[PDB]
């Protein structure tokens, strides 16, 4: 286990045996792909192979090393104000839970229909000094599940978190991180959906009727400062203890908007990664 | 234990067995609620149920995950002064122990008549820079039980704490936290009371005749600085190792004042969460 796990030799690939010639009836190279199945032909079948003892692990080819990597999924921003502190909808951020809200990683999952996981969340606040001294800028992140009082503005009553989670980070002390159970009323997170809100010819349809999990209302606790700032707290996300069901063809068209598939670009012709050739004859 | 405790499957709910029809005498659906007791009827009784093996824990429905969550119960503030340092009743805070001093969490307990617990106290000082440089602002929190010399002003003789508790926090070093035994001369904390100070038709009556536990006299040790500040040290509180006796109906009227039940708003009609319907016939 150790060795196998430390040496990373858990999932090893078979070796390529030796072959000889075959002047025989059954032709393995011939199958009818219309059966929708996949061929089973190998080196040893087609050629006069040798003998190679392999030693490549398919460890890094596991839904956990494919998925289990932290990725920017949101960049909370706060261009503070000292003029009006508090006021409605200010100096505090709120953002709806999700992804589809950002490619590269969105891309990645979408490779599967259903998915399930606990996550390694990490907050990377970066304090840009627009003043001659930033002081001590404390911070409060927290989670607002449904249906819950989402701060109208900066000091509601909801920042008491008498029964909510609020993580606090003060300049110097390291990046806040933490983790989380798999939050869904369903046995898995619906990375897609072919359902609607209802029969209302104006109902919602997508990944989304099924993902009302939150939002995040933010706060820079410290009170009024002299010299201004702007905070940019980056939100990274990692999938730990993941499972996946029914793979899908990757995405080749740059999306737009989340919780939707829509590609149809604003005017520009739909572009894809495929390159053009002069002729099939020369590559 | 582990698994059951790590998997959080300690308190599991029964499953819904299968039923068949009943053309029989005893009618479980009929009971007389006047007995003050509660009915005992189930799915299986009323319908022709199926068979569902459950898997929901009532773990998070425990007086410890209901109560055991940190909540703002006080926000100590100090608008420093450099003009007059010391002086009487300045630059040092003192506040009486309690709650009722702040909703959301006050609300929460009040759900029970009696309560008992040890607590996870955490101090979240936030230093607002009103100057061009905050220096090194050290801090001293401490606890003044009854009857004890409560600092008249900033440097008494009581800040020697020769036999008292004073926690010290210096800008950078993390949030001060600590904990505490259940402090009451009584076997439980009286979250209510129907008693008075005495027969004096001017005696006190409430939660409060029974809660003379303290106060907190504060201090910013550092001496005189140049560039001003304002400190806001937030006081969060968590209930660990809690017990509760005789549940009560929750509160629906926004209170006012603590250690009292009084709702009677200043003029405004007494408002409650109930919404109005046009008709009972349509919901």
């Amino acid at each position: 286990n150790y060795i196998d796990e430390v040496l990373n030799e858990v999932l090893v690939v078979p070796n390529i045996k030796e072959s000889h010639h075959t002047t025989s009836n059954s032709a393995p190279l011939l199958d009818a792909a219309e059966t929708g199945h996949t061929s089973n032909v190998q080196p040893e079948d087609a050629i006069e192979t040798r003998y190679v003892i392999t030693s490549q692990t398919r460890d890094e080819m596991s839904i956990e090393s494919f998925l289990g990597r932290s990725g920017c999924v949101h960049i909370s921003r706060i261009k503070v104000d000292y003029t009006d502190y508090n006021g409605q909808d200010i100096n505090f951020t709120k953002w709806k839970i999700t992804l589809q809200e950002m490619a590269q990683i969105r891309r990645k999952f979408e490779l599967f229909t259903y998915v399930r996981f606990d996550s390694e969340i990490t907050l990377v606040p970066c304090i840009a000094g627009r003043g001659d001294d930033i002081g001590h800028i404390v911070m409060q992140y927290m989670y607002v599940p449904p249906g819950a009082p989402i701060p109208s503005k900066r000091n509601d009553f909801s920042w008491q978190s008498g029964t909510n989670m609020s993580i606090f980070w003060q300049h110097g002390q390291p990046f806040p991180r933490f983790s989380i159970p798999f939050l869904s009323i369903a046995s898995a997170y619906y990375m897609f959906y072919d359902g609607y809100d209802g029969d209302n010819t104006s109902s919602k349809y997508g990944s989304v009727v099924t993902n009302d999990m939150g939002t995040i209302c933010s706060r820079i606790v410290t009170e009024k400062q002299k010299l201004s700032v702007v905070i940019t707290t980056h939100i990274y996300h990692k999938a730990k203890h993941t499972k996946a069901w029914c793979p899908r063809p990757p995405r080749a068209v740059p999306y737009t908007h989340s919780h939707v598939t829509n590609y149809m670009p604003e005017t520009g012709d739909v572009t894809t990664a495929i390159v053009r050739r002069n002729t099939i004859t020369t590559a | 234990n582990y698994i059951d405790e790590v998997l959080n499957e300690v308190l599991v709910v029964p499953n819904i067995k299968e039923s068949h029809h009943t053309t029989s005498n005893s009618a479980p659906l009929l009971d007389a609620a006047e007995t003050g007791h509660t009915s005992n009827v189930q799915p299986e009784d009323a319908i022709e149920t199926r068979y569902v093996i459950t898997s929901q824990t009532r773990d998070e429905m425990s007086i410890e995950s209901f109560l055991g969550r940190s909540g703002c119960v006080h926000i100590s503030r100090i608008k420093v002064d450099y003009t007059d340092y010391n002086g009487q009743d300045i630059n040092f805070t003192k506040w009486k122990i309690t709650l009722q001093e702040m909703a959301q969490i006050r609300r929460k307990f009040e759900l029970f008549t009696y309560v008992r617990f040890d607590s996870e106290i955490t101090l979240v000082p936030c230093i607002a820079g009103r100057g061009d440089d905050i220096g090194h602002i050290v801090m001293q929190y401490m606890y003044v039980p009854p009857g004890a010399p409560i600092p008249s002003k900033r440097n008494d003789f009581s800040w020697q704490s020769g036999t008292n508790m004073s926690i010290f926090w210096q800008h950078g070093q993390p949030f001060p936290r600590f904990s505490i035994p259940f402090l009451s001369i009584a076997s439980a904390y009286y979250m209510f009371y129907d008693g008075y100070d005495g027969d004096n038709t001017s005696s006190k009556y409430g939660s409060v005749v029974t809660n003379d536990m303290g106060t907190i006299c504060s201090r910013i040790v550092t001496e005189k600085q140049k560039l001003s500040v304002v400190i806001t040290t937030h006081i969060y509180h968590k209930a660990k190792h809690t017990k509760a006796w005789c549940p009560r109906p929750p509160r629906a009227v926004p209170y006012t004042h603590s250690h009292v039940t009084n709702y009677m708003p200043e003029t405004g009609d007494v408002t409650t969460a109930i919404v109005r319907r046009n008709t009972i016939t349509t919901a």
Partner: peptide, 19 residues
Amino acid sequence: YFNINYFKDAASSGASRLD
């Protein structure tokens, strides 16, 4: 060094294993 789930909950733990 391992299997020392310093934290109570299971959701908090390292990347799972392989089998």
